[PDB]
Design a protein around this ligand. Structure first.
Ligand code: 8GT
Ligand code: DOC
Ligand code: MN
Ligand code: MN
Ligand code: NA
Ligand code: NA
Ligand code: NA
Ligand code: NA
Length: 326
DNA sequence: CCGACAGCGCATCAGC
DNA sequence: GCTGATGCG
DNA sequence: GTCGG
């Protein structure tokens, strides 16, 4: 919060470029500058000072000066007053409605929560469910509730097959006191980079969580990735807990460490690390780290047995998950 | 100046 | 039905 | 929008 005013402005500009302008590289540029400023341990006094940080350039430096003088940014004040931009930005807040769909809906006169509810028939399943729980998905999850959810998931997974190993990652693994959702990594010795000796590995788990009424709806679902909705059970007479977003991802067991690194994040930390591995001649995804040859084509996976090994290959001093919330 | 910007699973549509 | 491109997160 | 080369 030391520079919360500046990071807020840059985040709003980023969302505008993504939702309205459909300029994804400007979106990431604003997010990168916002992340680097967010960890800068002084109260920024000027855009010149801010520009000394990597990722903050001339254009962002000028906007920081304006904000520090007046406390506002004219470019944003105009964007906030444009009904089309304002409607597009709102509709994208519904899960499954992206910049393209949002603009298409605004084009047809669908531009408010009310309009969306009248035209449920014009939404796909994902968007239909995002609308249904739009209000609940706006609330964060206290870490205490995350611990309750962790217990339910890990115990229900054990009851299907004691060989499962479910790991909660995301902001939870990074030590956050509150989370936007719950992210679950799943492994089973039957599923490795060498064979898939068991089918319906993920399905079995989803069905079990649906049986005990933990999972309440599904956004999408494939053989290795599930995105849906969950809800803690409420005690007698007390009010219902908010519905929550949950992702479950089954990963080959022998590739757990690249998977836990990828799903722990943060998303910006991933981008920074993966970009750096390229600078040093490697390519990292949630499964492996591979060397780049003379041509840039990926080589064979390198041996990995810990999160640190991946850091070693690219000459990075290891960083605890708590220190990866960029 | 200019090219690159991390990398991927699922849903949906167009084309054959 | 499959294959590729696009939207989405 | 930013930055290495
Ligand atoms: N949101 C987001 N997450 C990403 C991206 N790329 C990527 O690898 N991830 C990983 O996916 C994990 C789960 O997604 P998430 O949005 O819930 O991230 P989070 O747990 O840190 O934040 P949260 O507290 O709002 O839930 C992230 O921690 C991150 O490691 C991305 O582009 N956007
Ligand atoms: P969603 O649940 O609303 O956003 C969460 C997930 C986590 C990663 C995924 N994501 C988002 C954007 C991009 N570019 N790549 C991703 O994997 O959104
Ligand atoms: Mn999360
Ligand atoms: Mn998530
Ligand atoms: Na800079
Ligand atoms: Na959305
Ligand atoms: Na979030
Ligand atoms: Na609810």
């Amino acid at each position: 919060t030391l520079n919360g005013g500046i990071t807020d402005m840059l985040t709003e500009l980023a969302n505008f470029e993504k939702n309205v302008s459909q300029a994804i590289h400007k979106y990431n540029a604003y997010r990168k500058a916002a992340s680097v400023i967010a960890k800068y341990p002084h109260k920024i006094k000027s855009g010149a000072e801010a520009k000394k940080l990597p990722g903050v350039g001339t254009k962002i430096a000028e906007k920081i000066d304006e904000f520090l003088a007046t406390g506002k940014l004219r470019k944003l004040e105009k964007i906030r007053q444009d009904d089309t931009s304002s409607s597009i930005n709102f509709l994208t807040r519904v899960s499954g409605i992206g910049p393209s769909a949002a603009r298409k809906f605004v084009d047809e006169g669908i531009k408010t929560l009310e309009d969306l509810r009248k035209n449920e028939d014009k939404l796909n399943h994902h968007q239909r469910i995002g609308l249904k729980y739009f209000g609940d998905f706006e609330k964060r999850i206290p870490r205490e509730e995350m611990l309750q959810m962790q217990d339910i998931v890990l115990n229900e997974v054990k009851k299907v097959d004691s060989e499962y190993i479910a790991t909660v990652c995301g902001s939870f693994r990074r030590g956050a006191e509150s989370s936007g959702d719950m992210d679950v990594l799943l492994t089973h010795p039957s599923f490795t980079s060498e064979s898939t000796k068991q089918p319906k590995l993920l399905h079995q788990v989803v069905e079990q969580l649906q049986k005990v009424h933990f999972i309440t709806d599904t956004l999408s679902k494939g053989e290795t990735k599930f995105m849906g909705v969950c809800q803690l059970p409420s005690k007698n007479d007390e009010k219902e807990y908010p519905h929550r977003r949950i992702d479950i991802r089954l990963i080959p067991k022998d590739q757990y460490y690249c998977g836990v690194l990828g799903f722990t994040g943060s998303d910006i930390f991933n981008k920074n690390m993966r970009a750096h591995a390229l600078e040093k001649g490697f390519t990292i995804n949630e499964y492996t780290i591979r060397p780049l040859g003379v041509t840039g084509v990926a080589g064979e996976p390198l041996p990995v047995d810990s999160e640190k090994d991946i850091f070693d290959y690219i000459q990075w001093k290891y960083r605890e998950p708590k220190d990866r919330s960029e």
